[PDB]
């Protein structure tokens, strides 16, 4: 033995993910003739809990009618879901919004409907994202959007104010230059910039305000505005293929799944 101990009652580590592929395909009757040993069993024994279940004479259900597997995460969360929305009001206003994976963060200030349920299904999170935003409203506004990692300084989140950060801090880290008239669309990778390894979904104390958040995107505009028309932005987050999930968690209640 490696540790010099022993084990008598059969009970070990439990709930290893991915038991089965969810698209319906054929791997005749499944049960029937033989008496069902998989109906009655011991759930207190996890080896006896992993027995092939049956209760009735069943046969092959057949195949499915869509090759697109709607039960893998990498093609399920490809549809981009809501994050936040915000409007500008005056000249050179700098807006700042984080990406706070905490379930304590009720919407709008935090995770809304689909992001709050999905990113509180699991404990650990590592990988880059995708963000899709839409320019809506007044045209010919030359703004700038940039990412800021953890540790580095940035302006106050969820607050529209004037920018207190210089342009040499903004040009050195990384941003984009675009007008509302040229292309009107942003589909951006969110870089995984942290000295810590992974981020969590539901923590407490100072670990919640530090180890749940990973990144932040803040926007300052210019040439807004001429003759009075509101400019509205809205953030939709999407997924990429370099992220992996860890420790499947009990999903949230029907109460904290708040929709916007």
């Amino acid at each position: 033995d490696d540790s010099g101990g022993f084990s008598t009652t059969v009970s070990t580590e439990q709930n290893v993910p991915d038991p089965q592929v969810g698209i319906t395909t054929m791997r005749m009757d499944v049960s029937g003739v033989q008496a069902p040993v998989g109906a009655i069993t011991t759930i207190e024994d996890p080896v006896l809990a992993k027995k092939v279940p049956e209760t009735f004479p069943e046969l092959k259900p057949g195949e499915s009618r869509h090759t697109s597997d709607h039960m893998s995460i990498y093609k399920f969360m490809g549809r981009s879901h809501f994050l936040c929305t915000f409007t500008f009001n005056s000249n050179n206003k700098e807006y700042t919004f984080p990406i706070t994976l905490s379930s304590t963060s009720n919407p709008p200030h935090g995770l809304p409907s689909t992001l709050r349920w999905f990113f509180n299904l699991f404990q650990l999170y590592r990988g880059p994202l995708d963000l899709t935003i839409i320019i809506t409203g007044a045209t010919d506004v030359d703004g700038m959007a940039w990412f800021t990692p953890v540790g580095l300084a940035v302006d106050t989140p969820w607050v529209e104010k004037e920018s207190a950060l210089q342009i040499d801090y903004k040009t050195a880290l990384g941003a984009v230059r675009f007008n509302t008239r040229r292309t009107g669309n942003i589909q951006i990778r969110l870089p995984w910039y942290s000295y810590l390894y992974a981020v969590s979904g539901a923590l407490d104390g100072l670990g919640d305000k530090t180890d749940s958040t990973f990144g932040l995107v803040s926007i300052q505009i210019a040439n807004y505005n001429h003759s009075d028309e509101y400019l509205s932005f809205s953030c939709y987050l999407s997924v990429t293929e370099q992220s992996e999930f860890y420790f499947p968690r009990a999903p949230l209640n029907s109460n904290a799944m708040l929709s916007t």
Binding site: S3, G4, G5, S7, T8, T9, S11, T12, E13, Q14, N15, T42, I43, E44, D45, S103, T104, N120, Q123, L124, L196, Y197, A198, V199, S200, G201, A202, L203, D204, G205, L206, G207, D208, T210, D211, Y246, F247, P248, R249, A250, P251, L252, N253, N255, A256
Partner: protein, 216 residues
């Protein structure tokens, strides 16, 4: 021409963690050796971290009653923080170290008389007892207790944490945490014992120790 030998002057001598370079060296005297005994006054193995870290520590014990209704939180216990305690044997390995990596082996012992009925649940919960469901706690590596089949189960769980290692002197958040909800209520008859016993044993697996400190 015959040369008389001299003493060495500069050499890298010292431990890997306790290192001091001397400009004037000297040969260390050593007489005798580690003499083996055909008669040992004790019959044990010599002590090591393999036998001191891997030994079950009673970190918690309770007493579940009949008056506890369904899904009542009988015990809310922290795993590693109760392991880091002076009255156990791992304090001699965790006081002189700061950052660690380890695996947690939980064993829970209860005792029903078979005239009682009911059920208990012990779950290994990392992070928080947040808005996740009580009726969804089987996704955790857990244990299910019954008054019908068995009374002792043991649970193996890994290190689940955001950063690289765990800080004892100032932790970010507790790595693991166990809870006891009433999985099925304790029902008895007349004269049957209206209680049952409860024990929580714990030990480390695959222990790593780094970052020695001089302070307490």
């Amino acid at each position: 021409e015959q040369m008389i030998q001299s003493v060495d002057r500069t050499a890298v001598t010292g431990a890997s963690y306790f290192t001091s370079v001397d400009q004037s060296s000297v040969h260390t005297a050593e007489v005798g050796s580690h003499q083996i005994e055909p008669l040992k006054t004790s019959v044990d193995k010599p002590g090591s971290k393999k036998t001191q870290g891997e030994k079950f520590f009673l970190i918690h014990s309770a007493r579940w009653l009949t008056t506890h209704a369904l899904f009542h939180e009988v015990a809310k216990l922290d795993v590693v923080k109760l392991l880091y305690n002076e009255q156990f044997a791992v304090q001699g390995l965790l006081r002189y170290h700061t950052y660690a990596r380890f695996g947690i082996e939980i064993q829970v012992q209860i005792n029903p008389t078979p005239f009682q009925q009911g059920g208990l649940i012990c779950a290994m919960v990392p992070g928080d007892q947040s808005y996740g469901s009580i009726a969804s706690l089987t996704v955790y590596p857990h244990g299910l207790l019954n008054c019908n089949i068995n009374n002792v189960v043991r649970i193996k769980v890994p290190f689940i944490y955001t950063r690289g290692a765990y800080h004892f002197k100032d932790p970010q958040y507790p790595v693991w945490e166990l809870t006891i909800r009433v999985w099925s209520e304790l029902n008895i008859g007349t004269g049957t014992s209206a209680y049952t016993s409860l024990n929580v044993l714990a030990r480390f697996t695959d222990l790593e120790l780094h970052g020695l400190t001089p302070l307490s």
